[PDB]
Amino acid sequence: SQQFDPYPLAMQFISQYSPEDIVTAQIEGSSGALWRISPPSRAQMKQE
Amino acid sequence: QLLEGRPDQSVVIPHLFPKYIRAPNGPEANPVKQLQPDEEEDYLGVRIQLRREQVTKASDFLEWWVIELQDCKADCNLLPMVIFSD
Amino acid sequence: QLRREQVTKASDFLEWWVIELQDCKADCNLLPMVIFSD
């Protein structure tokens, strides 16, 4: 709330939400699976 | 240049990560209009890296991409996003 | 066609299938299809 205080629309929108309604998703930075790709398609990607 | 495989470069793309997302009761979420009115100059930048690993030189490695925020405070290995339920 | 590539002999290779038309005119590496929109 304090971050968006100088903006009224943000305060209204946040005010329309109860504390136990807004959640943060902590997504891991690294991928969760190997980047499978055919070498011809990788070469085509690099050429593109 | 990253696809060249040298594990020293890195590239940052501006304004692709919407930090604030509204999760409505409908089947279509979307970024919040009010929290970020420009809708294109308020998205955080993202720097992406490729990590190879030793097991035809190109196909001789495992590889996986890594995502980090443009300027992080917590270890740069974690991307937070705020989503509002309904 | 199946294309192998050198990195338990069967699991010692990478492999990926390749599709070509029966009788092509353009390099046989490209499959065209005509689709009509509406």
The token pair at C15 is: 């492999």
Residue C12 and residue A36: Cα distance in Å, rounded?
16
**Closest residue on chain B to A1 (Cα):** B35
Vertex A46, ends B57 and B2: CA angle to 5°? 70
Chain A interface residues (partner B, CB cutoff 8 A): 4, 7, 9-10, 12-14, 17, 21-31, 33-35, 39, 42, 45-46
Q: What is the DSSP string of chain C?
A: -EEEEE---GGGEEEEE----SS-SSTTT---------
Q: Do residues B2 and B11 lie in contact, with contact meaning Cβ atoms separated by under 8 Å? A: yes
Q: Do residues B61 and B54 lie in contact, with contact meaning Cβ atoms separated by under 8 Å? A: yes
- C6 and B55: CB-CB below 8 Å? no
To which H or E segment does residue A28 belong? strand A22-28
DSSP lists the bridge partners of residue C15 as: C4
